[PDB]
Design a protein around this ligand. Structure first.
Ligand SMILES: Nc1cccnc1N
Length: 165
């Protein structure tokens, strides 16, 4: 098995910005990796394409994936509304880490976050499942549209997404 690679093509108020790719750690967290992959291709009939990064805190993280309520209160996984914390093997070691957002134990859906700082206090409570492969520069440019309270000054969208070879 080769870990899958996913891409997001990011736009800022509709204007193309660049591409972020991610390695997904299917070898360590296959069930969590597979949910992100499938949401990124849209093969179940729903997913991330056209969704927004609704909360961006510079020096912390970029959060996205709420395609049902567009604001951090929604989303769903490919396995149902919620699924369990698969494992906490991987840690939040620094910028570029891809990890699941949640609302308590065993409440993973579709929302995720990209770290822009080390976030060690999240270790053992959010499932880490991937990392930025290319385009950390693009993540840094997104990040400049965020604010201390998370609200973005321009709309940051996933204009397109899918799986790379
Ligand atoms: N439903 C939900 C809400 C907040 C964060 N993650 C989630 N999956």
């Amino acid at each position: 098995m080769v870990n899958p690679t996913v891409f997001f093509d990011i736009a800022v108020d509709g204007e193309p910005l660049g591409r972020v790719s991610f390695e997904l750690f299917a070898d360590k967290v296959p069930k969590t990796a597979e949910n992100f992959r499938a949401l990124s291709t849209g093969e179940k009939g729903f997913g991330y394409k056209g969704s927004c990064f609704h909360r961006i805190i510079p020096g912390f993280m970029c959060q996205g994936g709420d395609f049902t309520r567009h604001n951090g209160t929604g989303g769903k996984s490919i396995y149902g509304e919620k699924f369990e914390d698969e494992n906490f093997i991987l840690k939040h070691t620094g910028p570029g880490i891809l990890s699941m957002a949640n609302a308590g134990p065993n409440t993973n859906g579709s929302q995720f976050f990209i770290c822009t700082a080390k976030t060690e206090w999240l270790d053992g409570k959010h499932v880490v499942f991937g990392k930025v492969k290319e385009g950390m520069n693009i993540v840094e440019a997104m990040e400049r549209f965020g604010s201390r309270n998370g609200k973005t000054s321009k709309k940051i969208t996933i204009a397109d997404c899918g799986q790379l070879e």
